[PDB]
């Protein structure tokens, strides 16, 4: 199997950076939302506020 020593505990810093980047991407796709379920291709009929968002 794989061999990881005590120095593998230093690898939490790139995982923390990955979590920070994923959180920033989640905030970016949270902000970027005025065309959500309002474009003319993936559109929704009247009553869109009652229904759940698609993403």
């Amino acid at each position: 199997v794989l061999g990881l020593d005590k120095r593998a505990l230093w690898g939490a810093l790139p995982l923390l950076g990955f979590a920070i980047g994923h959180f920033l991407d989640k905030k970016e796709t949270e902000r970027m939302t005025m065309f959500r379920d309002k474009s003319a291709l993936y559109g929704r009929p009247a009553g869109s506020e009652g229904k759940a968002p698609s993403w």
């Binding site: 796709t29 939302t33 065309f35 959500r36 993936y42 993403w55």
Partner: protein, 62 residues
């Protein structure tokens, strides 16, 4: 829809950038507005010297 929103934002930014380039070109053509392309020439020192020269007419005497 994320790409549609980002394209709409970048397109509106492009129109505002073109419009402010046109506004800045028309401002620098005429030097009309007081924000950019305007050299403020003031006659504060001339009015101060004229007020001093009017004040020293009263001081003239014996």
């Amino acid at each position: 829809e994320k790409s549609l929103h980002y394209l709409y934002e970048e397109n509106e930014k492009a129109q505002i950038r073109l419009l402010e380039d046109e506004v800045r070109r028309k401002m620098s053509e005429r030097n009309d507005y007081q924000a950019y392309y305007y050299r403020p020439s003031v006659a504060k020192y001339h009015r101060i010297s004229k007020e001093a020269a009017d004040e020293l007419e009263a001081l003239r005497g014996d």
